[PDB]
Scaffold this active site. Structure first.
Site, PDB file in Angstrom:
ATOM      1  N   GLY B  10       0.828  -1.217   0.000  1.00  0.00           N
ATOM      2  CA  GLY B  10       0.000   0.000   0.000  1.00  0.00           C
ATOM      3  C   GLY B  10       0.853   1.254   0.000  1.00  0.00           C
ATOM      4  O   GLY B  10       2.030   1.172   0.395  1.00  0.00           O
ATOM      5  N   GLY B  12       0.135   4.733   1.530  1.00  0.00           N
ATOM      6  CA  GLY B  12      -0.630   5.656   2.390  1.00  0.00           C
ATOM      7  C   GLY B  12      -0.072   7.069   2.324  1.00  0.00           C
ATOM      8  O   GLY B  12       1.003   7.264   1.722  1.00  0.00           O
ATOM      9  N   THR B  13      -0.780   8.027   2.924  1.00  0.00           N
ATOM     10  CA  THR B  13      -0.354   9.445   3.044  1.00  0.00           C
ATOM     11  C   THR B  13       0.531   9.604   4.287  1.00  0.00           C
ATOM     12  O   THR B  13       1.195  10.653   4.399  1.00  0.00           O
ATOM     13  CB  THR B  13      -1.568  10.379   3.092  1.00  0.00           C
ATOM     14  OG1 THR B  13      -2.168  10.270   4.384  1.00  0.00           O
ATOM     15  CG2 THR B  13      -2.590  10.063   2.020  1.00  0.00           C
ATOM     16  N   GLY B  15       2.657   6.953   5.110  1.00  0.00           N
ATOM     17  CA  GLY B  15       3.853   6.160   4.759  1.00  0.00           C
ATOM     18  C   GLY B  15       3.613   5.180   3.620  1.00  0.00           C
ATOM     19  O   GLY B  15       2.463   5.077   3.142  1.00  0.00           O
ATOM     20  N   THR B  16       4.671   4.478   3.205  1.00  0.00           N
ATOM     21  CA  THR B  16       4.655   3.425   2.154  1.00  0.00           C
ATOM     22  C   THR B  16       4.864   2.053   2.804  1.00  0.00           C
ATOM     23  O   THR B  16       5.804   1.925   3.610  1.00  0.00           O
ATOM     24  CB  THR B  16       5.745   3.691   1.111  1.00  0.00           C
ATOM     25  OG1 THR B  16       5.698   5.080   0.788  1.00  0.00           O
ATOM     26  CG2 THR B  16       5.588   2.847  -0.134  1.00  0.00           C
ATOM     27  N   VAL B  17       4.028   1.072   2.456  1.00  0.00           N
ATOM     28  CA  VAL B  17       4.027  -0.299   3.052  1.00  0.00           C
ATOM     29  C   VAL B  17       4.581  -1.289   2.022  1.00  0.00           C
ATOM     30  O   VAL B  17       4.072  -1.293   0.887  1.00  0.00           O
ATOM     31  CB  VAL B  17       2.615  -0.710   3.504  1.00  0.00           C
ATOM     32  CG1 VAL B  17       2.631  -2.012   4.285  1.00  0.00           C
ATOM     33  CG2 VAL B  17       1.942   0.397   4.301  1.00  0.00           C
ATOM     34  N   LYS B  32       6.604  -0.572   7.169  1.00  0.00           N
ATOM     35  CA  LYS B  32       6.066   0.802   6.971  1.00  0.00           C
ATOM     36  C   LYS B  32       7.235   1.786   6.986  1.00  0.00           C
ATOM     37  O   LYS B  32       7.890   1.897   8.032  1.00  0.00           O
ATOM     38  CB  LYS B  32       5.051   1.171   8.055  1.00  0.00           C
ATOM     39  CG  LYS B  32       4.163   2.351   7.683  1.00  0.00           C
ATOM     40  CD  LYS B  32       3.250   2.837   8.794  1.00  0.00           C
ATOM     41  CE  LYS B  32       3.496   4.282   9.176  1.00  0.00           C
ATOM     42  NZ  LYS B  32       2.505   4.771  10.163  1.00  0.00           N
ATOM     43  N   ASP B 125     -10.443   4.166  14.674  1.00  0.00           N
ATOM     44  CA  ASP B 125     -10.260   4.075  13.201  1.00  0.00           C
ATOM     45  C   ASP B 125     -10.527   2.646  12.726  1.00  0.00           C
ATOM     46  O   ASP B 125      -9.825   2.199  11.802  1.00  0.00           O
ATOM     47  CB  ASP B 125      -8.875   4.575  12.777  1.00  0.00           C
ATOM     48  CG  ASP B 125      -8.763   4.956  11.306  1.00  0.00           C
ATOM     49  OD1 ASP B 125      -9.816   5.243  10.689  1.00  0.00           O
ATOM     50  OD2 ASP B 125      -7.616   4.970  10.789  1.00  0.00           O
TER      51      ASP B 125
HETATM   52  C1  LIG Z   1      -4.737   1.417   6.205  1.00  0.00           C
HETATM   53  N1  LIG Z   1      -3.609   0.966   7.030  1.00  0.00           N
HETATM   54  C2  LIG Z   1      -2.357   1.441   6.443  1.00  0.00           C
HETATM   55  C3  LIG Z   1      -1.212   1.093   7.393  1.00  0.00           C
HETATM   56  C4  LIG Z   1      -1.100  -0.436   7.484  1.00  0.00           C
HETATM   57  C5  LIG Z   1       0.070  -0.905   8.388  1.00  0.00           C
HETATM   58  C6  LIG Z   1       1.411  -0.268   8.014  1.00  0.00           C
HETATM   59  O1  LIG Z   1      -0.234  -0.607   9.762  1.00  0.00           O
HETATM   60  C7  LIG Z   1       0.197  -2.395   8.251  1.00  0.00           C
HETATM   61  C8  LIG Z   1       0.500  -3.125   9.398  1.00  0.00           C
HETATM   62  C9  LIG Z   1       0.615  -4.476   9.313  1.00  0.00           C
HETATM   63  C10 LIG Z   1       0.397  -5.090   8.074  1.00  0.00           C
HETATM   64  C11 LIG Z   1       0.480  -6.479   7.945  1.00  0.00           C
HETATM   65  N2  LIG Z   1       0.243  -7.045   6.794  1.00  0.00           N
HETATM   66  C12 LIG Z   1      -0.046  -6.364   5.690  1.00  0.00           C
HETATM   67  N3  LIG Z   1      -0.247  -7.154   4.553  1.00  0.00           N
HETATM   68  C13 LIG Z   1      -1.080  -6.869   3.454  1.00  0.00           C
HETATM   69  C14 LIG Z   1      -0.711  -7.494   2.258  1.00  0.00           C
HETATM   70  C15 LIG Z   1      -1.421  -7.303   1.079  1.00  0.00           C
HETATM   71  N4  LIG Z   1      -1.000  -7.984  -0.067  1.00  0.00           N
HETATM   72  C16 LIG Z   1      -2.019  -8.870  -0.652  1.00  0.00           C
HETATM   73  C17 LIG Z   1      -1.265  -9.945  -1.422  1.00  0.00           C
HETATM   74  O2  LIG Z   1      -0.532  -9.284  -2.460  1.00  0.00           O
HETATM   75  C18 LIG Z   1       0.390  -8.271  -2.022  1.00  0.00           C
HETATM   76  C19 LIG Z   1      -0.309  -7.239  -1.122  1.00  0.00           C
HETATM   77  C20 LIG Z   1      -2.558  -6.464   1.107  1.00  0.00           C
HETATM   78  C21 LIG Z   1      -3.350  -6.214  -0.053  1.00  0.00           C
HETATM   79  N5  LIG Z   1      -3.993  -6.009  -0.961  1.00  0.00           N
HETATM   80  C22 LIG Z   1      -2.935  -5.842   2.304  1.00  0.00           C
HETATM   81  C23 LIG Z   1      -2.222  -6.039   3.461  1.00  0.00           C
HETATM   82  F1  LIG Z   1      -2.681  -5.394   4.552  1.00  0.00           F
HETATM   83  C24 LIG Z   1      -0.121  -4.971   5.713  1.00  0.00           C
HETATM   84  C25 LIG Z   1       0.085  -4.294   6.938  1.00  0.00           C
HETATM   85  N6  LIG Z   1       0.008  -2.966   7.073  1.00  0.00           N
HETATM   86  C26 LIG Z   1      -2.439  -0.952   8.043  1.00  0.00           C
HETATM   87  C27 LIG Z   1      -3.595  -0.499   7.149  1.00  0.00           C
HETATM   88 CL   LIG Z   2      -6.269   4.919   7.717  1.00  0.00          CL
END
Ligand SMILES: CN1CCC([C@@](C)(O)c2ccc3cnc(Nc4cc(N5CCOCC5)c(C#N)cc4F)cc3n2)CC1
Ligand SMILES: [Cl-]
Ligand SMILES: [Cl-]
Ligand SMILES: [Cl-]
Ligand SMILES: [Cl-]
Ligand SMILES: [Cl-]
Ligand SMILES: [Cl-]
Ligand SMILES: [Cl-]
Ligand SMILES: [Cl-]
Ligand SMILES: [Cl-]
Ligand SMILES: [Cl-]
Ligand SMILES: [Cl-]
Ligand SMILES: [Cl-]
Ligand SMILES: [Cl-]
Ligand SMILES: [Cl-]
Ligand SMILES: [Cl-]
Ligand SMILES: [Cl-]
Ligand SMILES: [Cl-]
Ligand SMILES: [Cl-]
Ligand SMILES: [Cl-]
EC number: 2.7.11.1
Lengths: 148, 290
Positions: B10, B12-13, B15-17, B32, B125
């Site tokens: 993802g 986001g505004t 950060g980048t995930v 993140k 949230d």
């Molecule tokens: C809005 N908010 C933004 C901040 C984010 C964060 C940084 O706090 C955070 C924490 C922990 C996390 C654990 N796991 C993930 N895995 C994911 C993996 C995905 N993949 C699907 C298969 O193909 C590749 C992409 C997809 C999708 N689509 C979504 C995912 F959440 C993302 C996390 N993000 C939380 C959400």
């Molecule tokens: Cl959010």
């Protein structure tokens, strides 16, 4: 139960704690804190001021466990107090996100972010506990008043 | 530097995930990245709060922060990796879930939320994007950027919290103070998505439109139900909508027991909203339910 009186106590605490600082006034902390709070209000980052009695008590808790007696300059003390303040804003602030220009008084920005991660690793449990445990808030509230 | 990025998850505004690999121990984690010299500043503040709270919120139904790294004018949070979120999962399964999954997901959400509240933390949230799902069928609540510790006496919290579709009526009326009940409303809204086509129960265009969609279904609260209502800061007269409007067509996967739980989460008066702890002891989560 007055903000200025609790700010004064914190400034008197900081002066007692940091013996090495010979030309530090207990008004210098107060000035530095009020400068940041005013600066954020007049730049429109917040509607009201952050510095209330409870937040000053919260800040004091951080300060007393972070600010070493061996602080070697007034400049180094400001750098730390403002790192503690920035984390008070970030943890207790109503607005979601606050800038770090008003809080930054070091050329080396890297050095600041490293202090944040230290203070968090040390205090994060107490930062939650002062909220969770009302008795512990009162203990810290009292201790602050007994610093004048 | 210590980790190897594979694919972005993802953008986001705040950060980048990325999905990443530990080069030392070869484990897959979520990363993140947060930039730390922004002329439009502020972003880091959210990251520091999220860290301070997740360090003290260790639970199988709350995303795990493993570590935090500071390098090259960048801050990097290291979460456990999750296969997707609930928003992508709906698009993946046609918005249609087996009733037994709806139970699993809500149960896990309430356990995680129950822990957060007991540890004196509001999430503020809740939404499918912030509910992480793994293939093995585990659910974990994430994104504590807008979350907050509570217990110290304050003048007010922020009324500009929760995405409009999951914001409870007290906060829509601009309520200065709110307790743990803020999250239990959002949880009710999410339950209704699981129980239908994964579509928002109350998808309003603004505050006014939001409050009209909540009252239209549940009924406009009376003075008896909610005496505090008219005294709220941004209160204004709304039409009396009847309390006779049925939920059966709205959540057609839930039977009577399910529908009862949903109504105790979706009490307009915050004081009347069921707690996470109470909800986990509801007949809907008994081993005696048809
Ligand atoms: C809005 N908010 C933004 C901040 C984010 C964060 C940084 O706090 C955070 C924490 C922990 C996390 C654990 N796991 C993930 N895995 C994911 C993996 C995905 N993949 C699907 C298969 O193909 C590749 C992409 C997809 C999708 N689509 C979504 C995912 F959440 C993302 C996390 N993000 C939380 C959400
Ligand atoms: Cl959010
Ligand atoms: Cl008071
Ligand atoms: Cl003053
Ligand atoms: Cl005096
Ligand atoms: Cl000196
Ligand atoms: Cl001032
Ligand atoms: Cl603002
Ligand atoms: Cl010391
Ligand atoms: Cl400055
Ligand atoms: Cl730098
Ligand atoms: Cl996006
Ligand atoms: Cl812990
Ligand atoms: Cl993992
Ligand atoms: Cl695992
Ligand atoms: Cl499971
Ligand atoms: Cl309060
Ligand atoms: Cl109320
Ligand atoms: Cl109602
Ligand atoms: Cl109740």
């Amino acid at each position: 139960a007055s903000t200025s009186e609790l700010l004064r106590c914190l400034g008197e605490f900081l002066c007692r704690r940091c013996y090495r600082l010979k030309h530090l006034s207990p008004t210098d902390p107060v000035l530095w804190l009020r400068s940041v709070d005013r600066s954020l209000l007049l730049q429109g980052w917040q509607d009201q001021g952050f510095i209330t009695p409870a937040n000053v008590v919260f800040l004091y808790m951080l300060c007393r466990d972070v600010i070493s007696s061996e602080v070697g300059s007034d400049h180094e003390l400001q750098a730390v107090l403002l790192t503690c303040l920035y984390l008070s804003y970030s943890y207790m602030g109503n607005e979601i996100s606050y800038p770090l220009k008003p809080f930054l008084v070091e050329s080396c920005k890297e050095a600041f972010w490293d202090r944040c991660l230290s203070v968090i690793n040390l205090m994060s449990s107490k930062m939650l506990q002062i909220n969770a445990d009302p008795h512990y808030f009162t203990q810290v509230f009292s201790d602050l008043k007994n610093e004048s | 530097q210590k980790y190897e990025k594979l694919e972005k998850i993802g953008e986001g505004t705040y950060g980048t995930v990325f999905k990443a690999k530990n080069r030392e121990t070869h484990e897959i984690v979520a990363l993140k990245r947060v930039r730390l010299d922004d002329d439009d500043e502020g972003v880091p503040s959210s990251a520091l709060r999220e860290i301070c709270l997740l360090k003290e919120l260790k639970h199988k139904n709350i995303v795990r922060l493993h570590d935090v790294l500071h390098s090259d004018k960048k801050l990097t949070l290291v979460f456990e990796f999750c296969d997707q979120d609930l928003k992508k999962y709906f698009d993946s399964c046609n918005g249609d879930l087996d009733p037994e999954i709806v139970k699993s997901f809500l149960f896990q959400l309430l356990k995680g939320l129950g822990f957060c509240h007991s540890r004196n933390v509001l999430h503020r949230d809740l939404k499918p994007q912030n509910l992480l799902i793994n293939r093995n069928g585990e659910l974990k609540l994430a994104d504590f950027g807008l979350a907050r510790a509570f217990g110290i006496p304050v003048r007010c919290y922020s009324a500009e919290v929760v995405t409009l579709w999951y914001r409870p009526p007290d906060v829509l009326f601009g309520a200065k103070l709110y307790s743990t009940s803020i999250d239990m409303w959002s949880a009710g809204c999410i339950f209704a998505e699981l129980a239908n086509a994964g579509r928002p129960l109350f998808p309003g265009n603004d505050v006014d439109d939001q409050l009209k969609r909540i009252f239209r279904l549940l009924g406009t609260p009376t003075e008896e139900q909610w005496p505090s209502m008219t005294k709220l800061p941004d209160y204004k007269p709304y039409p009396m909508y009847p309390a006779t409007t049925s939920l059966v067509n709205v959540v057609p996967k839930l039977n009577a027991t399910g529908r009862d739980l949903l109504q105790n989460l979706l009490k307009c008066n915050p004081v009347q909203r069921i707690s996470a702890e109470e909800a986990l002891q509801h007949p809907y989560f008994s081993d005696f339910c048809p």
